[PDB]
Structure formats: structure tokens, C-alpha cells
Design a protein around this ligand. Structure first.
Ligand SMILES: *[C@@H]1O[C@H](CO)[C@@H](O[C@@H]2O[C@H](CO)[C@@H](O)[C@H](O)[C@H]2NC(C)=O)[C@H](O)[C@H]1NC(C)=O
Ligand SMILES: *[C@@H]1O[C@H](CO)[C@@H](O)[C@H](O)[C@H]1NC(C)=O
Ligand SMILES: *[C@@H]1O[C@H](CO)[C@@H](O)[C@H](O)[C@H]1NC(C)=O
Lengths: 137, 107
């Protein structure tokens, strides 16, 4: 409803305290008819439907990444992959309080794909195998 | 009111220690302490803050330790550049800095 992007440009902590606003405003349900003209020009409705489909597809791609990372039900989840100093050398206080998520994303944008493959392969695919080998008896 | 060791000396490659104590009203245990490598003419460089970790870029040679009565700044692996004046500071998150008397390190 209200407060969307309230913590944009602020410290990373203030942004990481209000992820629920972004989460609820990612998927906007159809604004219902205020009131005849439910049948409309074909050309006009083609844009809106394609936009809704693209939004739904992006949301389900993000949820698919969540599912293959084992973080489907949570907004924040810690992982087993260690940070490699290659991607960033700054410490915790240099990141969560001094910088914003914008410049941070640009800094790790090159490595974001490399981390994604790691998050998907190194941990969860070994975790499920060790869970099957652990609960096998 | 914040008193340091007026001077201190250490050999090359040794670890020197600078004391920093004060009154009960301004107690080291009550607040946080930051250290500065301050050549008097030049702009000072932050070396230690919040009594923990270090300033960004500072070598792991500098170390700090805060007792309930006095603070200590330890500079391992002494260098010719370390022969400068060092100042400690008592502060909170909303009260200004309170510098000490200063300490001149000889090598
Ligand atoms: C960004 O906004 C924050 C506040 O949302 C600003 O930083 C705060 O400023 C107030 C007012 O002096 C202080 O009480 C806080 O302690 C400040 N927070 C921090 C973490 O320093 C900040 O100045 C704004 N600008 C930028 C570029 O971040
Ligand atoms: C960190 O990056 C370097 C260089 O790319 C690589 O050689 C090393 O194996 C990496 N370490 C981990 C734990 O991924
Ligand atoms: C990302 O890669 C580009 C080259 O494609 C390079 O110019 C840029 O400096 C890199 N940035 C970081 C933060 O690695």
C-alpha cells in the first residue's frame, strides 16, 4: 500500500528492515472495476495483458530461484557459501551502514551470476544428497 | 582531563604501548575510544575507532585494548613512519570528542 521504496538510498540496514513493503507491492492485484465497458478494443487490452504476464513471469522466475536455493518461504536466508574476497574486499561496517544496495548491486553485478550458480550447486545439491544419505537409516 | 603517557619508546620491529586514562567522570569503560596518528602540521589519519577492529586501510600492526581504567594502543612492527604524535579520544554517539594530552613515540 504505502511506504514502497521508503528506504531507497538509505543504509542497507534500514532497507533490510522493511523488505515486506517491497514484497507485497511486487505483485499488484488487478484494480477491480469501480463500476458496461468490460468489452473493450482488442488493441488496447493487448498491452495490459502482456504487461501482467511479464510481471507474473518475473515473479515466478524469482520464486524459482528461491526454490532451487531452498529459501521459498522466507525473505531472508543465510547460506553455506563463503564470501570470496575477489568479489568484494570491504568489511561488514563498510557495507551495511556506509553503502546502499544500488552501488552494491553494480559492484557485484558481474559476480551475481557466479554467486547464483554457487548458491544453487555448492550447498543445496549437496545438502539434499547428505539428507538422503543421513535419513537413509 | 584525559591523560596519556607523555612519551614512549620502542625498538625497531617491537610492539610499543601508549596508555590513555582519565577521570572517573570521563571513564574509558563508560564510553568508546578512538586513536589518531596526528603529525602536528599534517592532516591526522584515523587508526583506531570504537575500541574494536581498525580504520579502513590500516595495517594489522595497529591494535587497541581498553581496560576499565585506561586504554592502550599497541603498534606492533614499529616503522620509521611511526615516529609521530598519537592522540586518544573519549566520546559517545552524541557527545563530542575529548582528546588526550598526546604521546610522542620514539624508535
Ligand atoms: C540518508 O538518510 C540518512 C537518514 O535517513 C542520513 O543519515 C542520518 O542523519 C541523521 C540526521 O543527522 C542522523 O541522526 C543519523 O545518525 C544518520 N545516519 C547515519 C547512518 O549516519 C544521511 O545523511 C542521508 N544521506 C546519505 C547520503 O546517506
Ligand atoms: C576465490 O576466487 C579465486 C579466483 O577466482 C579462486 O581461485 C578460488 O578458488 C575462489 N575460492 C572459492 C572458495 O571459491
Ligand atoms: C565488471 O565487468 C566490467 C567488464 O565487463 C568491468 O569494466 C567492470 O569494472 C567490472 N566491475 C566490477 C565491480 O567488477
Amino acid at each position: 500500500f504505502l511506504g514502497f521504496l521508503g528506504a531507497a538510498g538509505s543504509t542497507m540496514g534500514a532497507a533490510s528492515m522493511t523488505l515486506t513493503v517491497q514484497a507485497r507491492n511486487l505483485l499488484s492485484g488487478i484494480v477491480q472495476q469501480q463500476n458496461q465497458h468490460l468489452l473493450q478494443l482488442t488493441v488496447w487490452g493487448i498491452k495490459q495483458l502482456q504487461a501482467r504476464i511479464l510481471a507474473v513471469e518475473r515473479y515466478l522466475k524469482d520464486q524459482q530461484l528461491l526454490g532451487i536455493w531452498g529459501c521459498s518461504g522466507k525473505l531472508i536466508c543465510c547460506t553455506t557459501v563463503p564470501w570470496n574476497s575477489s568479489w568484494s574486499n570491504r568489511s561488514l561496517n563498510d557495507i551495511w551502514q556506509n553503502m546502499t544496495w544500488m552501488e552494491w548491486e553494480r559492484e557485484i553485478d558481474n559476480y551475481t551470476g557466479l554467486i547464483y550458480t554457487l548458491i544453487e550447486e555448492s550447498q543445496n545439491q549437496q545438502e539434499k544428497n547428505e539428507q538422503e544419505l543421513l535419513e537413509l537409516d | 582531563v584525559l591523560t596519556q603517557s607523555a612519551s614512549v619508546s620502542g625498538s625497531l620491529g617491537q610492539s610499543v604501548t601508549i596508555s590513555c586514562t582519565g577521570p572517573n567522570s570521563v571513564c574509558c569503560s563508560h564510553k568508546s575510544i578512538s586513536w589518531y596518528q596526528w603529525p602536528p602540521g599534517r592532516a591526522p589519519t584515523l587508526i583506531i575507532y570504537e575500541d574494536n577492529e581498525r580504520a579502513p586501510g590500516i595495517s594489522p600492526r595497529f591494535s587497541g585494548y581498553k581496560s576499565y581504567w585506561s586504554a592502550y594502543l599497541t603498534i606492533s612492527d614499529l616503522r620509521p613512519e611511526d615516529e609521530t604524535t598519537y592522540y586518544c579520544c573519549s566520546y559517545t554517539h552524541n557527545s563530542g570528542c575529548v582528546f588526550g594530552t598526546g604521546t610522542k613515540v620514539s624508535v
